[model samples]
Target: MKLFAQGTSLDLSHPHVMGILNVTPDSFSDGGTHNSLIDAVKHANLMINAGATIIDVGGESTRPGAAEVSVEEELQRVIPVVEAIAQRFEVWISVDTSKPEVIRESAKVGAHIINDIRSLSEPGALEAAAETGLPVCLMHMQGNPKTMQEAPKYDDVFAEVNRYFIEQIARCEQAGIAKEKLLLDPGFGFGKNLSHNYSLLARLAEFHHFNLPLLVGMSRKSMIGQLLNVGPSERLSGSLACAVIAAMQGAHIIRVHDVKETVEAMRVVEATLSAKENKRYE
Candidate 1:
């Protein structure tokens, strides 16, 4: 699969890594780490050198119980970094936001993808995304960020998230966004509990039923921390395991904060798969 954005196109035939750059003060992990333009650009370069195909820039903190930032504040925080990265690097830039203004403005600078946790359900978001002509990664969340984790009830988490994507996909098409330009994320840790997240991961390939690219972000997530009984920084081993699982299950893009390590892990997995395919060819 290939995703075209602005002047660049992402070939998704193989697994790709998207380095996370949080320009917020409270993104649960790596928050306040890259809030400055110089620091942000430096970190971005480090990730790119480490083998990240995309740089995901997030302004607002979408962690559980996270408060919201104003449209102006979000733009102020994200645009400079977005603009700087685009100017400095030759990589795809994904803006992680649901605000219509941020979506529209980020594209103006050079954002190539709109990775919306809200799935473009916010007012004017669908319209703004369509107008930007950028590929969109629509994620499923049971409720709003502040309360999504309160009590995420689901008779069948996988089935329910699939259904949500069904509806959101149709909505995006209706709003003039081409189906070919869409990606799906199961929204691990956004609202799901440990079991819910694992169930989705175990069946992550099922999301490929949509025939669109699948993007999974499991680095240092609560799902990993909760399972291992550790904090965010201590979840690297678990995070790499999840990334390999997601890659084996056919995830097109793996989003992570530990780019260099994740990239190395993916390299090993890809080599094994390649060797197996070579044997078959022989």
Candidate 2:
């Protein structure tokens, strides 16, 4: 698979690490760590050194029950960091936002990808993304973060989620965004119970039929914490385990919080798979 944006193409033959850079005061995990441009730069540099292929900069908190910030505030929080990163680094910078104004302005300022958890269903979102002409990562959420977990239910979770992607991709294309500029994300923990989250991961390869790259965002999410009886700070091991599983199961991009550890884990897994393939070739 190929994902193009910001005049670059991401080869999705192997799993790649996309480091999270949250500039929100309430991201549910590591909320205020990099809520400013200075701290964001520091974090970006650290992630780049740690082998992060993409830096995903999120300004607004999409955690459950998370309050929405005004477009002005969202832009304020994100653009400075985007500008700073684009000016300093050469890595792919992704803007994690659902608001159209932020998406438009963020791209104008220099963002490589629009990682929208809402999957561009929001009003004006498709137009905003199309205007920028950048690669968009459309994520599937059962509902809005504020109420998605409340009485969440799916008749056939897999089929429903897949259907949502089918519709979302069609919608984006109808709005003039080409297939080469699209990615899919099964938004784990956004609106899922433990069962739903696990089932999605267990059968992730089924999503390869979409013919688009799969991006998994399972870093320190509630599912990991609740399942492992650990807090977000202590879920690194759990996160790594999930990343390896997702990678083995056909996830092209792993959006994670801990780049260094996740990259090392991926390296070992990739090497092992390579060795097996070579032996089979012989």
Candidate 3:
């Protein structure tokens, strides 16, 4: 599969890493860590150097129960940082936004893809995205972040999420977005409890039925916290383990916070999955 954005194309034959850069003051894990343009640039450059194929920049924190920000505020926070990154780096810059205005502005400033939690179903989003001709990652979120986890429910999480991707992909394509430019994300922690999250991961490869790339984000999520009782700062080990598992399950992209460690883990997994061992006569 070819992921086209910002005049670049990435082959999705194997799993790749998308470094997370949350340029918000209240993101769940590393809020305020890269809120400023300079800080965002520093972190983005570092991530690219550490072997991230995409730098996913987001302005708003979608953590459950987090207050929402206006599109104006979201644009103000995201565009400049996106411009700074594109101005400096030659790698793909993915705008992590669910707002139409932010997606429009980021695309104008050279963002390659729109990573929408709402999956571009909102008013004006489909038109704006189709006009940009950029790749998009459609994710499955049960509800808005604020109330998503309050009482999450899914009769059959796997079947529902699978259906969600099928419908979203069809909608985007019918709206003029190319199938080659679309990816699917099960949205590990968006609205799922531990079981729901794991259920999605176990059936991760089922999404390949759509013949599109799968973008997973299981890094330092609430599920990890639930399993290990570790804070975000300490979820690195668990995060890396999940990344490897996601890759083994045929995920095409892994969105993560710790890039270098995850990349190293993937490198080994890739070699093992592809390399054949020679048995010598003993």
Candidate 4:
């Protein structure tokens, strides 16, 4: 299995790390750290050398209750980074955006995947993504980032998420976006409570029923913080645990902030899974 765009391809036959590069100044974690062009390119190189197969660029901070970013502001922040990274590195670029303008421009600047937390639900977003002809990662979020975590509830998170995915897949297909160029992200902390997030993580393999590439992001999220009474910087162990759990269950993309350690952890997960399937160390 693989994803194709801009004459480049991503082999999805195994789990790969997608390092998070948020350019916004007020993200819940690692905000304002790499917004400059030089800073952004350097961070991308660091993650690439740390074994990142994909670089996820986010212009807006989508943390719960985060401030809104205008389309122009987002473009100013993301497109340059996407362009610079595209020029300096060969790693796949995935822009985390919901605006139609940003989507089209990112593709023009060499984005391979449109990782929208909104699932292209914004006006003209679907058409823009379809026109870009790039792979899109549709993430499931119960509400907008501004109020998503406010009393988020679900009778069955997995079933609800699958249902949303089914609807989104149809919408995307109808929008002239090819089904094969699609990936699914569970949007771990976007709208989930601690129990909901953990439940989804534990049963993330159930999402494979769709037979599509699964992309998951759970690094330094409150699901870890609340559970262990730890903060974002102190949650590396929790993040690593979450990554291994998802990777073991066949998640294709593991989106993370801590790249080097997560990549090393993924190596062990890859090695163990390979051995288990072959029934041999070699």
Off by over 4 Å in 3: 25-35, 276-282
Give the alpha carbon lDDT tens digit for every residue of 1-282 in model 4.
978788877888778999999887554124333436787787889999999999999887776667888877787788878998998888999998989999989989899999988888889999999999999898888777658437477888888988999999999998888889899988888787888888888888778778899999899988899999987799999999999999888899999999999989988888788779642222
Model 2 regions lying over 4 Å from their true place:
25-35, 148-151, 276-282
Q: Can you write out model 2's per-residue Cα lDDT over 210-239, one digit (the tens) per residue?
A: 778888999999889999898879999999
TM-score of each: 0.93, 0.92, 0.91, 0.93
lDDT of all predictions: 0.86, 0.83, 0.81, 0.85
Q: Which segments of candidate 4 are over 4 A away from where they belong?
A: 25-35, 278-282
TM-score, prediction 4: 0.93
On residues 1-282, what C-alpha lDDT tens digit does candidate 1 reach at each position? 788887778898678999988887553224333446677788889999999999999887777667787787787778888998998789999999989999999999999999987888889999999999999998988778657436578899998999999999899899999899999998888778899999998888677779999899998988888788998789999999999989987788999999999999988878776767531111
Residue 162 alpha-carbon offset, candidate 2, angstroms: 0.9
Against the hidden true structure, what lDDT does model 3 obtain?
Answer: 0.81
Worst 10 residues of 4 by lDDT: 26-35
Q: Which predicted model would earn the best TM-score?
A: 4
